């Protein structure tokens, strides 16, 4: 024995964060490290992943990777990048932190809508947007919705709820690429160069751990919504003790990335995603929470030469939700993007989220968010004073 299997991923990042911070590799240098991982939470997550006691998987090769963050300090309390993957070699690639996969629509809240309300492009969640034939700015390439259809004049909250692409890209045009990119920096996310395609895709040209999105980064980002607009750099360690006796404490300093009002508005709209939208498989009548779903697609080449079914398919299915205490981003798909997620497999990400959040909150007495000063309700929407 050396270390349990369920901590492989977590321990991998600890080694790295200590390395980045102090500059020493604890595998060749004696140190005592106190981490933020919630052992019991980890264990439970592992069972959700590797057992059939919580979620019905279509098979054992389907993958999952998620990260749970404490929205009050950015501490990563649980993380796991793969399931039923026992190719024992320690600290292999941890998918929870890799930004090689597309997070689709989970990018809409932080890349289009948050910035819009933040910068005054929209004054309320009732604002009327446009889901009509529309081409990517500066091109004749059309922006398609999954059903290749259009709802026309719908409200901001409804556009998000049903995850309509047109309104999202259009919104990104009104917000402006440069400040949309600056707004993501406030949430830890960045691209080499941002493009309109990023209004609904995290797909980027350069492949680094920094560019794009990963469960790790998405959770930290959404944590900002939950706590009122403050972004905390994800942390795996909070203290290390060198063999000499001197110690190092790591601070959870948070930076405001959006107004208190913007956060409440985004949150308000995102809970309707779980109630009447795409994220209905993660809904809990007793838990005040909000989230967003995402589905990536296959290229034409892929659909014709590699996809052998007429069933709705995708290489990636994602969910990123949060309660008032915890933020969790989930990723699902196969190591080989060419193996699609089908029917039952697509509900996996949401259900994995629901199971974990149940575990983390059913015991406590969860509180809701309170309408901050500067906004007022009016039936189903929220407006600025």
């Amino acid at each position: 024995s050396n270390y349990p299997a369920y901590m492989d991923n977590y321990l991998k990042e600890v080694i790295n964060q200590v390395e980045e911070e102090t500059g020493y590799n604890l595998l060749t240098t004696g140190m005592d490290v106190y981490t933020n991982v919630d052992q019991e939470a980890q264990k439970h997550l592992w069972d959700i992943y590797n057992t059939d006691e919580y979620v019905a998987y279509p098979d054992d090769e389907l993958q999952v990777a998620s990260t749970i963050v404490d929205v009050s300090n950015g501490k990563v309390i649980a993380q796991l990048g793969a399931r039923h993957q026992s190719s024992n070699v320690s600290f292999g690639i941890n998918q929870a932190v890799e930004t090689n996969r597309d997070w689709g629509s989970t990018m809409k809240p932080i890349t289009d809508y948050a910035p819009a309300l933040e910068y005054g492009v929209y004054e309320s969640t009732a604002t009327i947007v446009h889901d009509e034939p529309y081409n990517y700015p500066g091109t004749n390439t059309p922006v398609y919705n999954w059903d290749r259809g259009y709802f026309g004049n719908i409200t901001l909250q409804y556009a998000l709820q049903q995850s309509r692409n047109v309104p999202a890209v259009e919104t990104l045009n009104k917000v402006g690429l440069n400040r949309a990119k600056t707004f993501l920096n406030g949430l830890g996310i960045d691209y080499p160069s941002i493009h309109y395609s990023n209004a609904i895709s995290s797909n980027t040209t350069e492949s680094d751990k920094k560019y794009g999105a990963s469960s790790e980064k998405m959770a930290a980002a959404y944590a900002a919504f939950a706590n009122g607009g403050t972004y905390y750099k994800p942390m795996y360690i909070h203290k290390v003790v060198f063999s000499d006796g001197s110690e190092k404490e790591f601070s959870n300093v948070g930076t405001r990335a959006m107004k208190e009002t913007t956060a409440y508005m985004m949150t308000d709209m995102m809970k309707t995603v779980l109630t009447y939208g795409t994220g209905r498989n993660a809904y809990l009548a007793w838990l005040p929470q909000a989230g967003k779903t995402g589905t990536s697609n296959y290229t034409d080449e892929e659909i014709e030469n590699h996809i052998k079914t007429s069933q709705f398919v995708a290489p990636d299915e994602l969910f990123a939700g949060y309660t008032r205490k915890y933020s969790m981003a989930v990723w699902t798909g196969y190591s080989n993007r060419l193996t699609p997620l089908v029917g039952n497999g697509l509900t996996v990400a949401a259900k994995v989220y629901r199971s974990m959040m149940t575990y983390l909150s059913e015991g406590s007495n969860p509180e809701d968010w309170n309408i901050p000063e500067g906004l007022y309700r009016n039936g189903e929407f929220v407006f600025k004073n």
Binding site: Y3, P4, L26, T29, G30, D32, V33, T35, V37
Partner: peptide, 16 residues
């Protein structure tokens, strides 16, 4: 070289 690692409840979880 040996490095002990603890969780958030400050209880040992690994030694490397």
């Amino acid at each position: 070289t040996s490095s002990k690692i603890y969780d958030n409840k400050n209880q040992l979880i690994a030694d490397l």
